[PDB]
Amino acid sequence: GMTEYKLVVVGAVGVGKSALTIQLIQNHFVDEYDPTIEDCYRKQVVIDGETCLLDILDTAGQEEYSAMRDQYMRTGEGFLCVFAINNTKSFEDIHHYREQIKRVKDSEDVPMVLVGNKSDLPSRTVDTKQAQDLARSYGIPFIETSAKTRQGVDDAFYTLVREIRKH
Numbered sequence: 001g002m003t004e005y006k007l008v009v010v011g012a013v014g015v016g017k018s019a020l021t022i023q024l025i026q027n028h029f030v031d032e033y034d035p036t037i038e039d040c041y042r043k044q045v046v047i048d049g050e051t052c053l054l055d056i057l058d059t060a061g062q063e064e065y066s067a068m069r070d071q072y073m074r075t076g077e078g079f080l081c082v083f084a085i086n087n088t089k090s091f092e093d094i095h096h097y098r099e100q101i102k103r104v105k106d107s108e109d110v111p112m113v114l115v116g117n118k119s120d121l122p123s124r125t126v127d128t129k130q131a132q133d134l135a136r137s138y139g140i141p142f143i144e145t146s147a148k149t150r151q152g153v154d155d156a157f158y159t160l161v162r163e164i165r166k167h
């Protein structure tokens with residue numbers, strides 16, 4: 001029976017969650033993609049010699065702490081916590097996203113990967129060392145990515161699948 005992996009891509013609006021997901025599924029960089037549209041994607045892949053189905057939720061829209069929104073995010077098995085390396089607030093917001101995940105999953109060891117997106121941009125404001133240290137404190141991997149060039153994209157999602165398998 002082919003295993004399905006439910007991944008949820010989270011992070012501040014504009015960090016590149018939609019661009020990262022479309023790059024993984026369709027292998028192209030979409031410049032303009034409505035910031036309010038939330039959608040699901042599927043991709044069958046082989047990871048470490050095992051065929052599996054990725055079911056990815058590309059989150060969007062306003063902040064909502066309803067019983068229903070909490071139960072929907074509770075269905076996620078692994079979370080890609082994305083920030084943009086050229087926006088310090090998106091990086092500081094990561095503390096909030098992790099605490100919300102920890103709260104709804106009622107667990108301190110939820111499969112998760114920290115992702116620094118837009119590594120193609122020269123206007124960096126978040127130091128790789130600062131991100132690596134935050135990831136160490138949480139005990140999770142840190143993958144730098146660029147949805148524009150495809151740097152680290154397969155690596156970000158496949159790393160999250162491996163975190164779920166071990167868990």
Ligand SMILES: Nc1nc2c(ncn2[C@@H]2O[C@H](COP(=O)(O)OP(=O)(O)O)[C@@H](O)[C@H]2O)c(=O)[nH]1
Pocket residue numbers: 011012013014015016017018019020030031032033034035117118119120121145146147148149
């Ligand atoms: N240079 C660069 N721009 C990116 C990258 N990823 C996303 N963008 C741009 O950042 C903006 C927001 O991307 P989007 O995927 O809509 O972000 P979301 O709100 O997190 O889904 C768009 O103009 C994208 O083209 C990246 O890795 N590099």
Ligand SMILES: C[C@]1(c2nc(-c3ccc(N)cc3)no2)CCCc2sc(N)c(C#N)c21
Pocket residue numbers: 010059061062063064065066069070073096097100101104
């Ligand atoms: C999706 C997510 C979340 N989104 C936000 C957020 C913050 C600010 C803005 N502007 C937009 C969204 N903070 O956490 C993370 C995963 C776990 C849960 S549980 C739940 N009810 C969530 C919601 N909403 C969440």
Ligand SMILES: *SCc1nc2ccccc2[nH]1
Pocket residue numbers: 006007008039040041055056057072073075076077
């Ligand atoms: S829209 C189908 C769907 N719902 C999800 C929740 C969490 C992770 C992936 C998902 N896909």
Ligand SMILES: [Mg+2]
Pocket residue numbers: 017018019033034035036037058059060
């Ligand atoms: Mg989006």
